[PDB]
Amino acid sequence: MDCGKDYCVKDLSLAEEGWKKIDWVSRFMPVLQYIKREFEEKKPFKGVRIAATLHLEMKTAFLLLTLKAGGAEVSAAASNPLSTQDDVVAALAKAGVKVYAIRGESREQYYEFMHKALDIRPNIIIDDGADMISLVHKERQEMLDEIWGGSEETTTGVIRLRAMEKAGILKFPVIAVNDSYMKYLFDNRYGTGQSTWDGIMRATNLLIAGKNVVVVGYGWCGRGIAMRARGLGATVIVVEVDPIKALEARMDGFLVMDMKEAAKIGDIFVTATGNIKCIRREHFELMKDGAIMANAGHFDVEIWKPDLEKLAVEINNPRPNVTEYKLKDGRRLYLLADGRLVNLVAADGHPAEIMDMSFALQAKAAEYIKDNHERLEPKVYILPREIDEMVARIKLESMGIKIEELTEEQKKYLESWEHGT
Amino acid sequence: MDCGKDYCVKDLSLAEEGWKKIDWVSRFMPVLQYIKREFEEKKPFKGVRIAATLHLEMKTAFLLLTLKAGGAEVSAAASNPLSTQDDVVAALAKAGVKVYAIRGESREQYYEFMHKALDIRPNIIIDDGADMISLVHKERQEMLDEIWGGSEETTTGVIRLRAMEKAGILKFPVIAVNDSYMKYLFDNRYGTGQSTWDGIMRATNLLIAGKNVVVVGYGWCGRGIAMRARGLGATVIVVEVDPIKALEARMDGFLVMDMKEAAKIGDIFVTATGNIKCIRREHFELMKDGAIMANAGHFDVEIWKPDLEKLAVEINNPRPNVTEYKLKDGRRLYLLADGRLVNLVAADGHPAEIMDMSFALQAKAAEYIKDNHERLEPKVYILPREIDEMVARIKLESMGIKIEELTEEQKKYLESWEHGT
Amino acid sequence: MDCGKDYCVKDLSLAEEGWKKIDWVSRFMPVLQYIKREFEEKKPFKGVRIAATLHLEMKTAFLLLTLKAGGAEVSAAASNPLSTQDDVVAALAKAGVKVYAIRGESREQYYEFMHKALDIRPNIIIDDGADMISLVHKERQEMLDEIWGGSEETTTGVIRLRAMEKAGILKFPVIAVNDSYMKYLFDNRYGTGQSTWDGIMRATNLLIAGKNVVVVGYGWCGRGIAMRARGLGATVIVVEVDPIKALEARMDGFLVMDMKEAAKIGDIFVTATGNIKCIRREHFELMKDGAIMANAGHFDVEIWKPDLEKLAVEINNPRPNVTEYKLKDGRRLYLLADGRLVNLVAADGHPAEIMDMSFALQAKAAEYIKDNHERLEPKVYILPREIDEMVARIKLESMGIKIEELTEEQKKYLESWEHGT
Amino acid sequence: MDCGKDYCVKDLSLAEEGWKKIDWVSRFMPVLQYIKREFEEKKPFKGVRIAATLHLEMKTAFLLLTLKAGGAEVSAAASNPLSTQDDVVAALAKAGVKVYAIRGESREQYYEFMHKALDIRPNIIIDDGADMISLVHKERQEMLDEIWGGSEETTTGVIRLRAMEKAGILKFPVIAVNDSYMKYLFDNRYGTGQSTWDGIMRATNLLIAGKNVVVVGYGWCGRGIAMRARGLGATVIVVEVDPIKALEARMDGFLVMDMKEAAKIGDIFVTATGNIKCIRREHFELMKDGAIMANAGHFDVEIWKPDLEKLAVEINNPRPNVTEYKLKDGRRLYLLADGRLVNLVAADGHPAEIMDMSFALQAKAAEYIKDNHERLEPKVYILPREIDEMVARIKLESMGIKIEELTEEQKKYLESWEHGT
Ligand SMILES: NC(=O)c1ccc[n+]([C@@H]2O[C@H](COP(=O)([O-])OP(=O)(O)OC[C@H]3O[C@@H](n4cnc5c(N)ncnc54)[C@H](O)[C@@H]3O)[C@@H](O)[C@H]2O)c1
Ligand SMILES: NC(=O)c1ccc[n+]([C@@H]2O[C@H](COP(=O)([O-])OP(=O)(O)OC[C@H]3O[C@@H](n4cnc5c(N)ncnc54)[C@H](O)[C@@H]3O)[C@@H](O)[C@H]2O)c1
Ligand SMILES: NC(=O)c1ccc[n+]([C@@H]2O[C@H](COP(=O)([O-])OP(=O)(O)OC[C@H]3O[C@@H](n4cnc5c(N)ncnc54)[C@H](O)[C@@H]3O)[C@@H](O)[C@H]2O)c1
Ligand SMILES: NC(=O)c1ccc[n+]([C@@H]2O[C@H](COP(=O)([O-])OP(=O)(O)OC[C@H]3O[C@@H](n4cnc5c(N)ncnc54)[C@H](O)[C@@H]3O)[C@@H](O)[C@H]2O)c1
Ligand SMILES: O=c1[nH]cnc2c1ncn2[C@@H]1O[C@H](CO)[C@@H](O)[C@H]1O
Ligand SMILES: O=c1[nH]cnc2c1ncn2[C@@H]1O[C@H](CO)[C@@H](O)[C@H]1O
Ligand SMILES: O=c1[nH]cnc2c1ncn2[C@@H]1O[C@H](CO)[C@@H](O)[C@H]1O
Ligand SMILES: O=c1[nH]cnc2c1ncn2[C@@H]1O[C@H](CO)[C@@H](O)[C@H]1O
């Protein structure tokens, strides 16, 4: 531990490798590059203090450095104990971000470090999973009045915060960044679709083609995971609790059945529900020898590990990010990444170009809070759609794509009723 | 020829073949079969008069006969002059539906027949395109106070009616059936995806694989058309005006460019915009010899025919549903189905199982209007989502699919905010 | 019947509609257009007599007219009683092709007409299924000495002829056109893939997406049918007898099981085996109510109709090209196109651009026989690959595609062994 | 460091992690497990000496240990300097395999180690790329008469050996393992398809979806790479020199153009030609800023590095397995894995289940050489197809898949010629 008042990291001497990772991914993040250039000229966060709980790898680092280049004083804590990249965090510490995170930290350290990040007395909180916003309401009420607002990156976080609002406990405005179009249609679907399979392949070196792949949940993440599994040659089976989404999965060409039926025939299981105990004791009891299980949802409760432990006569670790649960009849079941987001724990998270768009929205949400806090209520808001459209337009221009535009005649037609057959 | 007070059809002696078509598709329409059984027992439309403007083929006939089995007196007019199937209409006339439609009728006959359908003095109007609702407001104001409400099947119709609302001229409640989940996610996407290519293949006998297919519009219809073109081995190019949708198309694996660029390289062009003049003079001037053009949108204004006519030195008709425009330099450009919905004119429309779900929603919308008209304003409404879920559950049960159900613990988890790391 | 010495057709007055079909498809057949222009200038078949057994629709007509434009006297008989298009054959009769074919002709007429075609005393026989070549060996031995050679279009035909060779009964050279690359990789795969689903959709108006589609046989036809079913949103199940092909199907993302297992869960069954009794009594007994069955193989023996008839308490005809077999328990099973090639009987066969390439090979095979008969043995041969490459090059040039070419350096590298690490 | 008569490896203390990798992948290699059980009982290689040049990762290790369990004395050298996994090699040395390989070894060490492996005086040579077979003929002629035969794993190797045969310099029989069905249809296509993208993702953390991916070569490897790129949401462009393969790519839904056209629009370039200078100076000059380039072919000559070096004003190394060539105008072009097989250098090679089947064929080829060398000429042979079928049947049984079997009536039908219409 290289720990001080301003940071706590595993080893500062890793910083040089961290910088290479940050410099690499930033070359492929044009929207955030555009924003950073604007932030550098206008310094909109001069005097502003920002605390962030995010997955601390390269792309996050580039967002945090973008906020800092806009004048912000920035602190950071891990969103997940096992998603932190120690070399990237050393680099952030060297850049003057007040970061407290060590890969594999305990649950107690996780909370201690999050408290240290809060010690900056933030005006803006950027969160991923809602633990930091939740922690401020539960244990750090003294600084509610300093806080202009928070933004939340993920589906699980937004559900928590909307529940806080309904119960009348939310004390400051929150931007649900997850609910922007340029987030959930891209990150949740295309990002998770690719990076889940990157993580699974990386941990296992197994063939995806000709496998029965069971995807639990057919929301934005699940449909991305399913689509990319099919793209890699798998036979995909979807498990859902919503009848409309179940039918969508069928029409998309996938088998649909319940969790017990899927447990009997799955080779690889991926959860993307954001829910608790989607796979549990009775499913593990049905699984084939050698079943691989991974979780893409935010918290490690989707696949219920206490149930696996109770069934197991031995728990082994045959590979990094593979835990073997050997059962009484000799079947071996494999859990990847200790049941935590497999894309972030067994790989490098979403690809750079996806987090570009998500984190461009995050940067703009911070700016929106700065610019609007005095007129917002303690409620959950969504960014105006004009920000989504601006992010899409910068991205399209960076790809060299020029699209058609609506003529005036066309706009008037679409606002008319008289033009029938 | 067979034309009186109660109906107007080409030839009643076609009825036998009409009945066979109706009986066939109804075997594969379980949701509407379920509803029909309920309507037959409870007769919710006893005493009620319903006028419908729909595409008059066999699935429509089954909806209209279902309404009649619920006790309704039913009239009907074509939604499109060229979508009518004369044999199905003969059967409807023999069943006592007051139907006025001849395939290939003129624009003036279309309106005369629509007026004849209105002569029933409807309580409920079921519309597809909003011409009948528009016609009642513009030319048949005498019967407005008899009308409880209307329902509208299609995107183009809903836009017209929302424009009528904004202008303060809408005089009764309208249900935007198009905006239900079980409609636009299934009909607009999967239905149009299949039946567009059915119609193009049927009209042309040409190969889809290894063609450059240009899809104009990447909404629900366009993404279904694109998806199925790719599934048939085409190289798909998407043209869009909305930056977010353009980026979605790129991430789905498709080229994105503007209409002039796409005009130079397209082999087959399909419009799905619901807009005017998406393809016009300067595009036709760029097209390759032998380009095929089709429209999947509601009205025949998407591909601007007056422009083709002005470019043409000859207009020929080499096949049913193919118009050849021979240009000065000798290039020949082909328009399918006279630029009208290609799925409905060159083929048999959406497949039975799709219209099952759309028309189940139509049946439920008619019932919703009956039940609730008194408490609705002269505005556009959307059916409660509970109806969508009920339609999805009946369909899943008919497919023999049993999905997972949420535990109580799970429902509480999803409503909680305290459960973090 | 308009029958004479020179032809036998249903009705000559259909010719005008026939010509429109022929003129249409020929516009999209560039390779055969190229060949026809060469044949017209060089007249390589001046004095030559050609008898053909092919599926008598538009594209075939254009091949036969191409041979005639090369100077050939041409006769023709149906390859299948139900694939004949009466209007196209009227046109051929009017053009001076000696064609004997009526759609729906009996098995006795089929043989009588084939004998009439043979009465031209052919130098070259073009066959599809090997019935005409077989008939000459069995019943018309007098004219073996006149015959330079035969070509065979299809997999089933080639197997028959290779069996004739092995048994020492083949009496003249045969070109296995089916075995050319530009045939089986394109026609058998991409052609059958599209046109099978065209035929199924056309006959039924049912949804392909979210159906369990069972494909029996995973050869060139089967893999095309499977690939396009998946492309239309089906869940595809493959039944195979070859273990290597079964594994290929699994790795392509399809379920693989035996015929009894597939019979229990299939919604739509398609046979492409070229074999006998692939689906028979015990499979029909397992099928779900409303199962649709179609055959894509050459002969109607793949789905064993005598078994369906024995199980049925009623046989009905609810639609053209749909036969209903109603079983004792009330289940209804539907056979399309009377179990004959569904693409040709319920639709218009392969698309024009595919038959362009197949029939360009047929034209070149006729020319190869003309040019080589005196040096060939009574064996089955395959066209030199240079003809395949020439067909591919003409097609690519007609699409405006210019490919890379091998440099001399590269050719030498590929012929070297010394250049290692 | 740990380098003596019997082996040469980086560090023996890595062996523990090597053994874990070997044990892991072997759990998913049922065909080779089956063979190993037979080899252990029958010891077919007792007294036999085998030298192998293969990519030295864990699946290879399992093949080599299988040969050893069959009684063989085994030596091994790297097939590529950068594919070696140091921990796996340590484990092989501890198991008594005479292995000489250090990851990152120079070209001269590569040859020195290959000579050390040859010092065992092999009866059988197992080769990947043909360098070891080539080396024995060129520099170790003294031991030719000890050598019964060689087997060759890869396409590039087989071409070299067929060139050696043609030149009359091949001195012993070679089995072209690459040419077995269960190799090129599975390894070359499905294996390379997955592991190429695994390696590109791992090296770069970039998004595949919505990229223009240029695949150079549309053979078995290229069609697998293209198929999986499309499955990951890329727009795929194929470059080919063979007109038939170019047309296949078009029908598969991909753009086809020449290398200069593709150079202008590609985002990611992957070569799979087995040829020299497919991408060279004039292509690099056309490439967009940030283009990524990777090679999937055997040798690093496909992308011509000397050309990049001459264009570059700086060569940097921003990531492991990424080389940056910064050009005069400021564009940066990135080459992955120093232009060497990207799947094996930037990742872990083909997945376990694929190498199971390829290496099962290798084991059977070694046995075939042992059993039959006396009756083979100094030529290139292909394994009897019965071995392919046996490998496929063991795999299917391990997957729990039971396929249809042919009846006797069916077998007779397929051998008959009399059964026509
Ligand atoms: N790994 C990543 O990088 C990443 C990226 C984005 C989001 N996420 C997380 O993924 C999770 C899902 O997010 P989303 O945006 O797809 O949510 P969503 O609400 O769109 O989808 C979740 C789906 O799960 C279904 N579901 C819930 N409980 C289920 C159960 N027990 N069995 C089957 N289906 C069930 C719901 O019906 C819903 O359709 C959340 O935890 C979110 O925070 C992870
Ligand atoms: N059976 C059928 O043929 C069928 C079925 C359903 C809907 N429809 C009709 O299809 C049309 C589209 O419906 P939808 O539900 O997809 O609507 P939508 O609003 O979901 O999609 C239309 C899309 O077109 C785009 N667009 C508009 N003008 C454009 C232009 N000039 N160039 C390019 N893109 C343009 C918009 O950005 C939008 O994404 C409507 O006319 C609707 O009534 C037809
Ligand atoms: N409809 C058309 O337009 C069209 C086009 C081309 C070919 N064909 C016909 O299609 C048939 C198949 O041709 P192909 O080129 O695909 O042949 P093929 O030899 O490539 O494939 C046939 C496959 O069927 C498998 N098979 C045989 N008996 C089986 C059984 N009982 N159950 C399961 N699998 C079985 C074989 O193992 C083989 O893989 C032939 O009759 C051919 O003449 C039709
Ligand atoms: N694990 C791996 O990375 C892996 C696996 C298997 C094979 N390989 C190697 O991959 C390479 C290709 O193997 P394959 O089995 O696909 O061979 P193949 O012969 O099936 O395919 C090579 C293709 O490249 C085309 N081609 C040749 N020169 C070209 C050029 N200049 N431009 C465009 N196209 C060109 C040829 O027309 C041919 O279609 C070989 O080096 C082989 O040894 C690597
Ligand atoms: O590489 C990455 N860096 C930072 N955040 C990421 C990365 N990959 C995915 N997520 C984010 O993780 C959240 C779930 O906790 C998702 O919302 C996604 O946006
Ligand atoms: O077969 C059909 N019968 C009736 N309506 C149909 C059919 N196919 C599509 N539509 C409907 O046509 C509308 C556009 O006018 C779409 O909204 C779709 O619901
Ligand atoms: O439209 C068509 N015209 C002529 N032949 C066709 C058509 N479609 C498919 N086939 C041919 O029918 C053979 C099986 O008997 C196939 O070999 C195919 O080449
Ligand atoms: O993981 C692996 N181990 C061993 N060989 C491999 C692996 N992945 C691919 N190849 C082999 O590499 C050859 C090209 O040199 C290919 O022939 C393939 O069989």
PDB file of C-alpha atoms in Angstrom, chain D residues 27-130:
ATOM      1  CA  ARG D  27     -11.019 -31.284 -19.386  1.00  0.00           C
ATOM      2  CA  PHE D  28     -12.630 -29.981 -22.609  1.00  0.00           C
ATOM      3  CA  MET D  29     -10.714 -32.164 -25.062  1.00  0.00           C
ATOM      4  CA  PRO D  30     -12.760 -35.420 -25.115  1.00  0.00           C
ATOM      5  CA  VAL D  31     -11.514 -36.810 -28.453  1.00  0.00           C
ATOM      6  CA  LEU D  32      -7.876 -36.590 -27.403  1.00  0.00           C
ATOM      7  CA  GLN D  33      -8.825 -37.963 -23.958  1.00  0.00           C
ATOM      8  CA  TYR D  34     -10.356 -40.960 -25.752  1.00  0.00           C
ATOM      9  CA  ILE D  35      -7.209 -41.457 -27.808  1.00  0.00           C
ATOM     10  CA  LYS D  36      -4.974 -41.029 -24.754  1.00  0.00           C
ATOM     11  CA  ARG D  37      -6.831 -43.817 -22.909  1.00  0.00           C
ATOM     12  CA  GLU D  38      -6.204 -46.109 -25.912  1.00  0.00           C
ATOM     13  CA  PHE D  39      -2.551 -45.057 -26.194  1.00  0.00           C
ATOM     14  CA  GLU D  40      -2.053 -45.705 -22.459  1.00  0.00           C
ATOM     15  CA  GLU D  41      -3.377 -49.255 -22.735  1.00  0.00           C
ATOM     16  CA  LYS D  42      -1.675 -50.213 -26.006  1.00  0.00           C
ATOM     17  CA  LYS D  43       1.531 -48.124 -25.946  1.00  0.00           C
ATOM     18  CA  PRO D  44       1.783 -47.885 -29.781  1.00  0.00           C
ATOM     19  CA  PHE D  45       4.823 -45.548 -29.591  1.00  0.00           C
ATOM     20  CA  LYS D  46       6.953 -47.634 -27.224  1.00  0.00           C
ATOM     21  CA  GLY D  47      10.512 -47.173 -28.523  1.00  0.00           C
ATOM     22  CA  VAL D  48       9.435 -44.435 -30.958  1.00  0.00           C
ATOM     23  CA  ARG D  49      11.018 -40.987 -31.104  1.00  0.00           C
ATOM     24  CA  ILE D  50       8.921 -37.979 -32.181  1.00  0.00           C
ATOM     25  CA  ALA D  51      10.054 -34.412 -32.756  1.00  0.00           C
ATOM     26  CA  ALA D  52       7.366 -31.725 -32.986  1.00  0.00           C
ATOM     27  CA  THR D  53       7.275 -28.141 -34.153  1.00  0.00           C
ATOM     28  CA  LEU D  54       3.953 -26.753 -32.895  1.00  0.00           C
ATOM     29  CA  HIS D  55       2.683 -23.635 -31.147  1.00  0.00           C
ATOM     30  CA  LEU D  56       3.709 -24.392 -27.573  1.00  0.00           C
ATOM     31  CA  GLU D  57       0.648 -23.597 -25.483  1.00  0.00           C
ATOM     32  CA  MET D  58      -1.479 -25.849 -23.323  1.00  0.00           C
ATOM     33  CA  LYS D  59      -3.456 -27.797 -25.964  1.00  0.00           C
ATOM     34  CA  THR D  60      -0.186 -28.669 -27.743  1.00  0.00           C
ATOM     35  CA  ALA D  61       1.252 -29.741 -24.392  1.00  0.00           C
ATOM     36  CA  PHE D  62      -1.695 -32.138 -23.990  1.00  0.00           C
ATOM     37  CA  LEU D  63      -1.050 -33.655 -27.426  1.00  0.00           C
ATOM     38  CA  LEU D  64       2.665 -34.090 -26.617  1.00  0.00           C
ATOM     39  CA  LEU D  65       1.868 -35.653 -23.197  1.00  0.00           C
ATOM     40  CA  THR D  66      -0.627 -37.956 -24.987  1.00  0.00           C
ATOM     41  CA  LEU D  67       2.107 -39.144 -27.397  1.00  0.00           C
ATOM     42  CA  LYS D  68       4.403 -39.662 -24.380  1.00  0.00           C
ATOM     43  CA  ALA D  69       1.658 -41.655 -22.577  1.00  0.00           C
ATOM     44  CA  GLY D  70       1.597 -43.821 -25.718  1.00  0.00           C
ATOM     45  CA  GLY D  71       5.298 -44.575 -25.024  1.00  0.00           C
ATOM     46  CA  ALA D  72       6.943 -41.989 -27.324  1.00  0.00           C
ATOM     47  CA  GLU D  73      10.108 -40.108 -26.495  1.00  0.00           C
ATOM     48  CA  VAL D  74       9.134 -36.563 -27.484  1.00  0.00           C
ATOM     49  CA  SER D  75      11.055 -33.418 -28.379  1.00  0.00           C
ATOM     50  CA  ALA D  76       9.544 -30.020 -29.246  1.00  0.00           C
ATOM     51  CA  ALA D  77      10.409 -26.640 -30.703  1.00  0.00           C
ATOM     52  CA  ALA D  78       8.289 -23.550 -31.305  1.00  0.00           C
ATOM     53  CA  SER D  79       6.335 -23.103 -34.533  1.00  0.00           C
ATOM     54  CA  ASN D  80       6.501 -19.364 -33.924  1.00  0.00           C
ATOM     55  CA  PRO D  81       8.918 -17.423 -31.655  1.00  0.00           C
ATOM     56  CA  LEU D  82       6.071 -15.399 -30.099  1.00  0.00           C
ATOM     57  CA  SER D  83       3.377 -18.121 -29.646  1.00  0.00           C
ATOM     58  CA  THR D  84       5.290 -19.989 -26.933  1.00  0.00           C
ATOM     59  CA  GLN D  85       3.836 -19.880 -23.410  1.00  0.00           C
ATOM     60  CA  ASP D  86       6.780 -20.038 -21.012  1.00  0.00           C
ATOM     61  CA  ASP D  87       4.806 -21.625 -18.146  1.00  0.00           C
ATOM     62  CA  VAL D  88       3.446 -24.421 -20.320  1.00  0.00           C
ATOM     63  CA  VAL D  89       6.955 -25.152 -21.652  1.00  0.00           C
ATOM     64  CA  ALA D  90       8.351 -25.366 -18.081  1.00  0.00           C
ATOM     65  CA  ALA D  91       5.697 -27.979 -17.306  1.00  0.00           C
ATOM     66  CA  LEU D  92       6.602 -29.961 -20.426  1.00  0.00           C
ATOM     67  CA  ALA D  93      10.280 -29.929 -19.369  1.00  0.00           C
ATOM     68  CA  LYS D  94       9.266 -31.212 -15.904  1.00  0.00           C
ATOM     69  CA  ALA D  95       7.237 -34.000 -17.578  1.00  0.00           C
ATOM     70  CA  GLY D  96      10.353 -35.156 -19.484  1.00  0.00           C
ATOM     71  CA  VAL D  97       9.491 -33.693 -22.910  1.00  0.00           C
ATOM     72  CA  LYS D  98      12.686 -32.414 -24.503  1.00  0.00           C
ATOM     73  CA  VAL D  99      11.421 -28.943 -25.299  1.00  0.00           C
ATOM     74  CA  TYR D 100      13.484 -25.995 -26.525  1.00  0.00           C
ATOM     75  CA  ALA D 101      11.507 -22.762 -26.636  1.00  0.00           C
ATOM     76  CA  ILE D 102      11.559 -19.334 -25.014  1.00  0.00           C
ATOM     77  CA  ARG D 103       8.824 -16.833 -25.829  1.00  0.00           C
ATOM     78  CA  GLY D 104      10.340 -13.987 -27.809  1.00  0.00           C
ATOM     79  CA  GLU D 105      13.376 -15.970 -28.969  1.00  0.00           C
ATOM     80  CA  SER D 106      15.244 -14.609 -32.005  1.00  0.00           C
ATOM     81  CA  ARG D 107      15.075 -16.132 -35.483  1.00  0.00           C
ATOM     82  CA  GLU D 108      18.537 -17.650 -34.927  1.00  0.00           C
ATOM     83  CA  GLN D 109      17.555 -19.178 -31.555  1.00  0.00           C
ATOM     84  CA  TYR D 110      14.385 -20.519 -33.217  1.00  0.00           C
ATOM     85  CA  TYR D 111      16.591 -22.536 -35.604  1.00  0.00           C
ATOM     86  CA  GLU D 112      19.112 -23.506 -32.901  1.00  0.00           C
ATOM     87  CA  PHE D 113      16.242 -24.867 -30.759  1.00  0.00           C
ATOM     88  CA  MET D 114      14.713 -26.646 -33.752  1.00  0.00           C
ATOM     89  CA  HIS D 115      18.114 -28.355 -34.320  1.00  0.00           C
ATOM     90  CA  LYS D 116      18.174 -29.365 -30.619  1.00  0.00           C
ATOM     91  CA  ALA D 117      14.742 -30.951 -31.020  1.00  0.00           C
ATOM     92  CA  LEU D 118      15.995 -32.832 -34.085  1.00  0.00           C
ATOM     93  CA  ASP D 119      18.907 -34.235 -32.014  1.00  0.00           C
ATOM     94  CA  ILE D 120      16.505 -36.880 -30.647  1.00  0.00           C
ATOM     95  CA  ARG D 121      16.836 -38.492 -34.126  1.00  0.00           C
ATOM     96  CA  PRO D 122      13.077 -38.689 -34.737  1.00  0.00           C
ATOM     97  CA  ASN D 123      11.198 -41.496 -36.428  1.00  0.00           C
ATOM     98  CA  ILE D 124       8.236 -39.130 -36.825  1.00  0.00           C
ATOM     99  CA  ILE D 125       8.181 -35.384 -37.347  1.00  0.00           C
ATOM    100  CA  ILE D 126       5.045 -33.451 -36.446  1.00  0.00           C
ATOM    101  CA  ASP D 127       5.236 -30.024 -38.074  1.00  0.00           C
ATOM    102  CA  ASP D 128       3.273 -26.761 -38.270  1.00  0.00           C
ATOM    103  CA  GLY D 129       4.510 -24.570 -41.118  1.00  0.00           C
ATOM    104  CA  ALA D 130       6.962 -27.111 -42.615  1.00  0.00           C
TER     105      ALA D 130
END
